[PDB]
Design an enzyme around this catalytic site. Structure first.
Site, PDB file in Angstrom:
ATOM      1  N   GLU A   1     -44.966 -87.117 -18.604  1.00 58.75           N
ATOM      2  CA  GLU A   1     -44.124 -88.189 -19.105  1.00 58.75           C
ATOM      3  C   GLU A   1     -44.305 -89.438 -18.253  1.00 58.75           C
ATOM      4  O   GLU A   1     -44.662 -89.359 -17.075  1.00 58.75           O
ATOM      5  CB  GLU A   1     -42.662 -87.731 -19.119  1.00 58.75           C
ATOM      6  CG  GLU A   1     -41.636 -88.669 -19.771  1.00 58.75           C
ATOM      7  CD  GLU A   1     -41.968 -89.065 -21.203  1.00 58.75           C
ATOM      8  OE1 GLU A   1     -42.739 -90.027 -21.412  1.00 58.75           O
ATOM      9  OE2 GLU A   1     -41.434 -88.424 -22.129  1.00 58.75           O
ATOM     10  N   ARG A   2     -44.107 -90.600 -18.873  1.00 61.77           N
ATOM     11  CA  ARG A   2     -43.981 -91.837 -18.119  1.00 61.77           C
ATOM     12  C   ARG A   2     -42.751 -91.776 -17.224  1.00 61.77           C
ATOM     13  O   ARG A   2     -41.728 -91.195 -17.582  1.00 61.77           O
ATOM     14  CB  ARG A   2     -43.869 -93.031 -19.061  1.00 61.77           C
ATOM     15  CG  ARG A   2     -44.780 -92.999 -20.268  1.00 61.77           C
ATOM     16  CD  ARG A   2     -44.358 -94.081 -21.237  1.00 61.77           C
ATOM     17  NE  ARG A   2     -45.373 -94.408 -22.229  1.00 61.77           N
ATOM     18  CZ  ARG A   2     -45.499 -93.794 -23.397  1.00 61.77           C
ATOM     19  NH1 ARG A   2     -44.678 -92.809 -23.718  1.00 61.77           N
ATOM     20  NH2 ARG A   2     -46.444 -94.161 -24.248  1.00 61.77           N
TER      21      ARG A   2
ATOM     22  N   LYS B 250     -34.485 -89.696 -30.916  1.00 62.54           N
ATOM     23  CA  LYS B 250     -34.988 -88.409 -30.454  1.00 62.54           C
ATOM     24  C   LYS B 250     -34.236 -87.939 -29.220  1.00 62.54           C
ATOM     25  O   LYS B 250     -33.896 -86.759 -29.111  1.00 62.54           O
ATOM     26  CB  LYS B 250     -36.484 -88.503 -30.167  1.00 62.54           C
ATOM     27  CG  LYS B 250     -37.110 -87.190 -29.765  1.00 62.54           C
ATOM     28  CD  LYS B 250     -38.533 -87.365 -29.285  1.00 62.54           C
ATOM     29  CE  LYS B 250     -38.574 -87.813 -27.840  1.00 62.54           C
ATOM     30  NZ  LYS B 250     -39.968 -88.083 -27.401  1.00 62.54           N
TER      31      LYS B 250
END
Ligand SMILES: Nc1ncnc2c1ncn2[C@@H]1O[C@H](COP(=O)(O)OP(=O)(O)OP(=O)(O)O)[C@@H](O)[C@H]1O
Ligand SMILES: Nc1ncnc2c1ncn2[C@@H]1O[C@H](COP(=O)(O)OP(=O)(O)OP(=O)(O)O)[C@@H](O)[C@H]1O
Ligand SMILES: Nc1ncnc2c1ncn2[C@@H]1O[C@H](COP(=O)(O)OP(=O)(O)OP(=O)(O)O)[C@@H](O)[C@H]1O
Ligand SMILES: [Mg+2]
Ligand SMILES: [Mg+2]
Lengths: 383, 483, 434, 113, 380, 156
Positions: free
Chosen positions: C179-180, C153
């Site tokens: 997001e992390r 991705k």
């Protein structure tokens, strides 16, 4: 502290006035030095106490009717839903970020209304009748209420006239009477608007061949749709010639939920001009399931109790009082008609949902659009 | 007699807020000046919340509320036998006042540990699906849980009708006086049961406490407790009672209405937090008293309606925890032709065979074992895979046994006849018989077998070896259909 | 001019004795360990506004001075934000000095009006063969990316940034909504080595702006960080006049963060525990991603489905806005096919012959027919035999297998660690090639 | 500390102010000066509409509302109990509780005799 | 009539009488002197109950500040409202009464961190419960610290060896990542987490001092018998020389179980920030969220999907994002997290289970069906 | 969880004496997912779970042999001759449950007599966990049996 004990405080019982007259010679000098810190008092105007969640609480407004168009000083309209003893709670037809506490609320003196007439034909308006097509104001038009009660039993007749859709599967197998409601129900991406667009293009082909009383004037209401899809649809109607007979009411997904809740009533009032003058209307409520989601938002933000699917419980009356206005009128009322095509989006073919089963028990028939016949290329995917 | 006065602050939805009445007790009967009664339930610091025993249309703002000094009570005694009363005592059958009766409280503390003894003597239902598989002793609360129309009422009516058949044959001490509490039901439905009970003769021993659907929600909440107080007269004075709370499911809905309108915070399914205490306060009054307290008993039959066989329901799970046994009635068993539709795999009796007929304790032990072998082998021949001829023997014998437990709705069989019927099916004497006419084969087995062999099994209570051979030698001199 | 009235978690009440700030205006808490920015949610009455904090509220005192900025959250926009990492309130997180701002734009904005809208509905050419043929991208549309981990991705993100900058001349914004921080750093370092972000003096040749709101940020900071990504992309659209790519990474976490700020503001939750305003909080984001007369914004939004449940109201409201879906599969990735776009599961609304023409339509309708006929006979090959079935049915198997291979493509951003050079494939060479 | 006991106990938030008003007026032996100064303020709201604007109108600032009541309760009829109550009821906007705190003052006064 | 506007009042404060009493009783001729309540750095308890004290006053208290009652029981100022402070109590609220004095300590919540914490069993606030005296070689550090940003991190490359073959082959775990040990009850959750802590005792005696990994086990909501069984196991193997144990057991207050993962993380963040490597294990993250749901429902914060607070995702993400692998200019240290989530009937669609699956990198799913098949660890 | 935790943490063995606690726990609708039984699970050292499906089969005590978990089931606590028999009984009873998916459909003819042997071994093991209780003599009708620990390990 009973009420028999507080109305005794009406009559005077002091018999000693050594500070009634002391502050009465000092109150008006005390008020006069704090005058630039007083907002001017408000009785027949309104002042916003609290605004948030798309509901404003308005102090004052002593003579608002229930359900009346109020206008903020920012230029934004509202509707006085609940008149309370201390405030009046209005719902803001627009963005609530431009309303502040302390803003003046004005009275228009008229229950919520949209421009109806011949001059609204051809135009793209919002959920309140203000035109968004950029080609000026609405001329040759007059204001009519958006919450008119439907005609009763004696003001109707049976549907007789056949209102051709132009769709082969529809006009052969599920044909549409001219004062009828027909639900277009199906999943996402199943040609729901395709059946309703082909009905509108078909009346342009037939209006130029019928003698001026059998003409159908369509109205398309978009609730929760993207602006680009609405703009791609006005281009299609302009290039087919169908815009001459069509009104385009648009409350897109970025608009406020009271503008999307009101847009099918705004468009029904514009289509009721042709029903009430002996002409024939056609109205499409594209995603009436998106109008119930907008009304669910306003009811939850008004802290009304959730329901079966978190819907207000009066969400049946939301759609029933709307779709009952699509009638075939009797001969003493002109003989006009209004044909509704509500559209309901279904999740994974489940027609036993709350809003789906509500509109089925309101409308006269259904046009089921199967998502498995649509994947096989059988289009229109009429179940 | 100083009478404290309370002014009504507001009245709505059958609830009236009253200013004053500081002296009023919690759960005290109050009296409005319109004549309608009330009960002070939540005594708040600024007002009293009163549930209205009747229609709140006659109560206005500022009406005078008088307290009666007394916690809510009902007339108890033998004068209530035969009469149809409303939710709190008052008779509605049009036969005058309740003569020979005494007013006692409806909220009594249940008898504690030292006031009990073991439930040992049986209460015969007359339903042989019940008296064999899930037998019920005197002093045991048994749930009749089922679907909307699974014959739950029929099981309860047959217990009442059968007691009249037993009360004509037993001495005066061991006679069972029934009370039927109808909560939230139709008034036409109640009038069909009083019509049935006078035609049967069961109305001589029956009290009919009727809180219909037109009654106020505090009249249907309170009617199980008022019927239990009428039923506890017989328990407290050495006699035996039988209380049936038809739709305790409809009592909890009437109690949820008062709780939600007295502003109590809602729990699971908008129900009060103390709903469990609503039914455990009531069902723990069904006791078998010790011989120091008379030896009297009270046997309860709560009725709970489920929705789609959903016994995992909030109120349904509460009453399965309270009651001893359970008579689960299934919809698909009802239409398969099995009447009563008792789920034998789900129906238990926590007293067990300690309080059942000894003449069926030895006969129906192999009945519930052969039916346990019938259940899992019918799941596998449902597909149509294969046969074993020892699997097909228990699949064929249990089909006689399931067909044997079927019974007529308005006829309750005596315990002696049921044991003979179960003996003829468990000792193989109703083999060589088609599976379809066992519903009609056992009319021969009751009629042709001698009417004086039932008397020996009734008096002994047990098939003696001088009777175990004599009746199986009479179960061969009988003519069965087909054969 | 205003002072802190209440601190209840991330929700601060500020009291203004003068005039109140507007709803959605930005408030700076005067004197705090970190820069604390509040955003006005409602006017409560009694001269009090209710605010949602963009940072932690620990250490906040009732009576702390709060300065109204007279405007919503204003972020630096322009070409000077390219190659930088920015948070929701516009501060640089990449630790490379201040952001050279062309302008400072409010992150709250109405959608482009009806006259400003585009009616044309054309195709955004991406240079990737499988998403230009089988699931074309609408210029100005929303694209669901049903990827994951190890399906490539991130290489597909950086190739979309590359080919839109190379061919169409538009820039990109990455909005890392929730997001992390390990994954947001992995994207930053992968963009540095693949050339789409440059550091130092060559900073102006970078193609992507990273707008990051991490998971450890409060729910107000994550709910507005997708609007900060809009506003950077809207400057390139409305002032620079470009065809901008936007990447709202995990549009579900935009929904999930806005559902938390509705719950903290005391709003009654809607069906399935979502906010009553889920349709309008999501639709307010998605209606600014459109084509105007100046340029366009096309957004590739990663879509998470909550309980593998497409009828859940968070994907069902999202799928009403989506104009194409690109599904990345592990089964396609285990065959060595890169990009791992599933040729049958990927859908587009641009795929009908009235916007892409009948020549392009019948190729993609014909390609999808061949692989459908090949992949429903894979349970009659294993149990009957490969040489069993007919010469026509194995003619499709030979034709599909050299189409299933031909949907592969080497990527220009992946050539620094794979050796093979990248290949931009034009649209006419894809139709005629297939 | 210890205050006198109220004769009868009452409910809250308006009858709880009247209990405390009765207790500091029973300590100071001002049970009928503070009572009759309440009855003057019942009348004073009937005369002046701008005095009752300081109890009903929510748009008056609290800096104005406490600097009118402090600047008209000076130099005449002070009693330091009416003066200190009505700046506390003006600091919190509770000046509209003045009818309800007077009625519960009378029930404490009638039970005092 | 003209007086009907004042017939019913409305109050913007529930505690109006506590402001009226602060202006009427100092007007008595006696109590003008020496009798006036302090409100800035002191407070009075209005209401107590269920471990929440509503405290009037404390005008200068900070949000999240540790306050002290006059009985010595501590508390955290968690709701700061316009007229009062909602204080979550760090013990039993039975010793607190209405009208008690609440002093602010000036400090946000602190725990001792440092090399003195190794080998010691502390409670949820850092105080030692093994009875070996005070923490000696420590320093005070904050409990809720900001997680390191993008530039402070580097890529997770160095492997963390659990010693479990099902883990180290199939689910490889790196120094600085956060891996969820999710499963049902008695599926071997702790078995996997204790094998990780024991194996770092073996690995630490064979690697140089910069590569040693120091474990911290946070026991939230467990019983003291189980925790004492685990100190006895850690002492028998010798793993207590590298392990800290932060134990907020079931009899502890819900603010202690809520703050114990943050207290253990701050003790474990010492090794990350000084270049060494840490291993933080939360015995039950789900148990911690149940304790935080208790304080929020009692502070009357609006309830969510399962009656949990809206920020309950922000609860666990702000904790778990503190497990990082730092860059080379910050020492290069690391912190590896192992949150433990107990599912019921193995559904990962549960509210708290969906939250921690989103935050963490991987998951170690333990299935009870494989547990009865002889597989151990029952790793799916 | 903290009302329950305040109660259970007092029921402990201390250095003064020892409280051996046996608590029945009602699960509301045969539902161990419910939070009042699920909170109790973390407090106990031995959780004998009784099942309705074992009770409807006639096996009494209706103890679920798989779902019952103790902390005394380590091999270094009860020895290896008790741990491997208990771990072996649980393996045969779990394999039978994975086969009973296909027995109730097909009927025990296509298992190649390795899985047919473990069906008959588990069916003997299932009945051998049943036992007449001395307090259920009035219910079961049989005198109760006290089985010693050595005779259980030797039998299984
Ligand atoms: N008869 C048809 N033949 C071919 N294509 C069709 C036909 N009817 C509709 N379509 C196309 O199929 C797609 C979906 O149809 P349409 O948009 O009318 O459905 P809808 O129910 O309005 O879906 P949505 O939920 O997206 O609004 C569109 O691209 C449309 O042009
Ligand atoms: N054993 C039976 N044999 C034949 N008919 C029966 C039997 N039991 C009940 N019925 C009939 O079935 C119908 C349902 O029974 P019944 O009304 O007693 O059930 P219920 O559980 O009380 O249902 P309801 O919800 O109406 O109260 C009635 O017509 C009844 O007479
Ligand atoms: N690999 C293994 N081999 C053998 N027994 C094991 C293994 N892993 C765990 N067990 C045993 O399984 C039982 C329960 O496992 P454990 O308590 O470690 O898991 P848990 O998920 O933390 O349980 P709980 O829900 O009680 O917290 C204990 O008796 C433990 O010793
Ligand atoms: Mg459509
Ligand atoms: Mg554990």
């Amino acid at each position: 502290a009973d009420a028999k004990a507080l109305d005794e405080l009406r009559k005077p019982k002091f018999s000693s006035k050594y500070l009634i007259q002391h502050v009465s010679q000092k109150l008006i000098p005390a008020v006069k030095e704090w005058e630039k810190s007083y907002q001017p008092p408000v009785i027949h105007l309104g002042r916003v106490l609290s605004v948030g969640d798309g509901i404003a609480r308005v102090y004052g407004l002593k003579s608002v009717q229930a359900g009346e168009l109020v206008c903020f000083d920012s230029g934004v309209k509202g509707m006085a839903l609940n008149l309370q003893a201390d405030h009046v709670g209005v719902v803001v037809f627009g963005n609530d970020s431009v309303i502040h506490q302390g803003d003046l609320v004005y009275r228009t003196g008229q229950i919520v209304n949209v421009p109806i007439g011949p001059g609204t034909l051809g135009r793209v308006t919002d959920g309140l009748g203000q035109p968004i097509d950029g080609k000026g104001p609405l001329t040759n038009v007059r204001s009519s209420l958006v919450e008119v009660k439907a005609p009763g039993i004696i003001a109707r007749q049976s549907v007789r006239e056949p209102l051709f859709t132009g769709v082969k599967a529809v006009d052969a197998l599920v044909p549409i009477g001219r004062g009828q409601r027909e639900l277009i129900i199906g999943d996402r991406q199943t040609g729901k608007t395709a059946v309703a667009i082909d009905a509108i293009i078909h009346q342009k082909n037939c209006n130029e061949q019928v003698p001026k009383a059998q003409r159908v004037y369509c109205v398309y209401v978009a609730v929760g749709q993207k602006r680009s899809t609405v703009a791609q649809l006005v281009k299609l109607f302009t290039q087919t010639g169908a815009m001459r007979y069509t009104i385009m009411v648009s409350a897109t997904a970025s608009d406020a939920a009271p503008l999307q809740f009101l847009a099918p009533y705004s468009g029904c009032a514009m289509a009721e001009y042709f029903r009430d003058t002996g002409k024939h209307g056609l109205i499409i409520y594209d995603d009436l399931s998106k109008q119930s989601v907008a009304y669910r938002q306003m009811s939850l933000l008004l802290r009304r109790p959730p329901g079966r699917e978190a819907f207000p419980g009066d969400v049946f009356y939301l759609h029933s009082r709307l779709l009952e206005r699509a009638a075939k009128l009797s001969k003493e009322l002109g003989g006009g008609s209004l044909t509704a095509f509500p559209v309901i989006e279904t999740q994974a073919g489940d027609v036993s949902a709350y809003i789906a089963t509500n509109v089925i028990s309101i409308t006269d028939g259904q046009i089921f659009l199967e998502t498995e016949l649509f994947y096989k290329g059988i289009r229109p995917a009429l179940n | 007699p100083v009478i404290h006065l309370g002014r009504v602050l507001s009245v709505g939805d059958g609830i009236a807020r009253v200013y004053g009445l500081k002296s009023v007790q919690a759960g005290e009967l109050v009296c409005f000046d319109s004549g309608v009664k009330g009960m002070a339930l939540n005594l708040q610091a600024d007002h009293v919340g009163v549930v209205v025993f009747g229609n709140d249309s006659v109560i206005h703002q500022g009406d005078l509320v008088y307290r009666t000094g007394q916690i809510v009570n009902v007339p108890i005694g033998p004068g209530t036998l035969g009469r149809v009363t409303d939710g709190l005592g008052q008779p509605i059958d049009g036969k005058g006042p309740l003569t020979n009766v005494r007013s006692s409280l409806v909220e009594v503390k249940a008898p504690g540990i030292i006031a009990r003894q073991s439930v040992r003597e049986p209460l015969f239902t007359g339903v042989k699906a019940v008296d064999a598989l899930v037998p019920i002793g005197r002093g045991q609360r048994e749930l009749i849980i089922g679907d909307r129309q699974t014959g739950k009422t029929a099981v309860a009516i047959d217990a009442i009708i059968h007691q009249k058949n037993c009360n004509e044959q037993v001495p005066k001490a061991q006679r069972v006086y029934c009370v039927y509490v109808a909560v939230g039901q139709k008034r036409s439905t109640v009038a069909q049961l009083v019509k049935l009970f006078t035609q049967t003769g069961a109305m001589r021993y029956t009290i009919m406490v009727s809180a219909t659907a037109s009654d106020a929600a505090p009249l249907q909440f309170l009617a199980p407790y008022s019927g239990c107080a009428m039923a506890e007269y017989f328990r407290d004075t050495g006699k035996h009672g039988l209380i049936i709370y038809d739709d305790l499911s409809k009592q909890s809905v009437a109690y949820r209405q008062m709780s939600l309108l007295l502003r109590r915070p809602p729990g699971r399914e908008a129900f009060p937090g103390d709903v469990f205490y609503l039914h455990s306060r009531l069902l723990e009054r069904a006791a078998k008293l010790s011989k120091e307290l008379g030896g009297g008993s009270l046997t309860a039959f709560p009725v709970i309606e489920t929705q789609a066989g959903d016994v995992s329901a909030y109120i349904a799970t509460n009453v399965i925890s309270i009651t001893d046994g359970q008579i689960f009635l299934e919809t698909e068993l009802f239409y398969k032709g099995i009447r009563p539709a008792l789920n034998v795999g789900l129906s238990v009796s926590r007293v067990g065979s300690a309080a059942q007929f000894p003449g069926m304790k030895q006969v129906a032990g192999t009945l519930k074992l052969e039916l346990a072998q019938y259940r899992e082998v019918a799941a596998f021949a449902q597909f149509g895979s294969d046969l074993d001829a020892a699997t097909q023997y228990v699949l064929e014998r249990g089909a006689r046994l399931t067909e044997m437990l079927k019974q007529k709705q308005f006829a309750p069989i005596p315990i002696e006849r049921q044991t003979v019927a179960v003996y003829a099916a468990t000792k193989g004497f109703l083999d060589k018989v088609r599976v379809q006419d066992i519903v009609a084969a056992e009319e021969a087995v009751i009629s042709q077998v001698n009417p004086a062999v039932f008397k020996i099994l009734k008096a002994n209570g047990k098939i003696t070896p001088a009777l175990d051979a004599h009746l199986k030698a009479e179960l061969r001199k009988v003519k069965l259909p087909g054969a | 001019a205003g002072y802190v009235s209440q601190v209840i978690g991330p929700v601060v009440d500020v009291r203004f004795d003068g005039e109140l700030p507007s709803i959605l205006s930005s408030l700076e808490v005067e004197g705090h360990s970190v820069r604390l920015v509040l955003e006005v949610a409602q006017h409560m009455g009694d001269n009090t506004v209710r605010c949602i904090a963009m940072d932690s509220t620990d250490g906040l005192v009732r009576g702390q001075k709060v300065v109204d900025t007279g405007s919503p959250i204003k972020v630096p926009v322009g070409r000077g934000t390219l190659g930088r990492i920015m948070n929701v309130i516009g501060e640089p997180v990449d630790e490379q000095g201040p952001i050279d701002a062309a302008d400072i734009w409010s992150i709250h904005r109405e959608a482009p009006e009806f006259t400003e809208q585009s009616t044309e509905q054309e195709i955004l050419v991406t240079g990737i063969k499988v998403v230009d043929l089988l699931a074309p991208y609408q210029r100005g549309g929303k694209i669901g990316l049903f990827g994951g981990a190890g399906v490539g991705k991130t290489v597909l993100i950086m190739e979309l940034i590359n080919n839109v900058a190379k061919a169409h001349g538009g820039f990109s914004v990455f909005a890392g909504v929730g997001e992390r921080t390990r994954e947001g750093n992995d994207l930053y370092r992968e963009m540095i080595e693949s050339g789409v972000i440059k550091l130092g003096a060559e900073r102006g040749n970078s193609k992507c702006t990273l707008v990051y709101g991490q998971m450890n940020e409060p729910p107000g900071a994550r709910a507005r960080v997708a609007l900060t990504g809009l506003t950077v992309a809207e400057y390139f659209r409305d002032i620079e006049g470009q065809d901008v790519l936007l990447f709202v990474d995990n549009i579900f976490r935009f929904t999930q963060a806005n559902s938390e700020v509705s719950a903290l503001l005391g709003r009654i939750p809607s069906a399935v525990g979502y906010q009553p305003t889920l349709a309008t909080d999501l639709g307010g984001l998605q209606e600014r991603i459109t084509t105007t007369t100046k340029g366009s914004i096309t957004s590739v939004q990663a879509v998470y489905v909550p309980a593998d449940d497409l009828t859940d109201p968070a994907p069902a409201t999202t799928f009403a806005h989506l104009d194409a879906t690109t599904v990345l599969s592990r089964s396609i990735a285990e065959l060595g096919i890169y990009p791992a776009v599933d040729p049958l599961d990927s859908t587009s609304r641009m795929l009908n012959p009235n916007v892409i023409g009948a020549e392009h339509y019948n190729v993609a309708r014909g390609v999808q027919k061949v692989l459908q006929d090949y992949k429903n006979l894979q349970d009659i090959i294993a149990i009957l035999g490969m040489d069993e079935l007919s010469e026509e049915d194995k003619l499709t198997v030979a034709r599909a297998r050299k189409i299933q291979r031909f949907l592969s493509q080497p990527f220009q951003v992946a050539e620094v660690f794979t050796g093979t050079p990248g290949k931009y494939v034009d649209l006419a060479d894809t139709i005629s090639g297939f | 500390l210890k205050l006198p006991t109220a004769p009868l106990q009452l409910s809250g938030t308006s009858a709880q102010i009247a209990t405390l008003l009765w207790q500091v007026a029973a300590k100071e032996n001002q049970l009928d000066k503070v009572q009759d100064e309440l009855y003057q303020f019942i009348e004073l709201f009937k005369q002046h509409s701008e005095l009752r604007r300081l109890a009903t109108d929510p748009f008056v600032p609290t800096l104005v509302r406490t600097k009118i009541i402090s600047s008209v309760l000076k130099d005449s009829g002070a009693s330091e109990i009416t003066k200190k109550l009505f700046e506390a009821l003006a600091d919190e906007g509770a000046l509209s509780a003045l009818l309800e705190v007077t009625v519960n003052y009378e029930e404490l006064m009638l039970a005092h005799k």
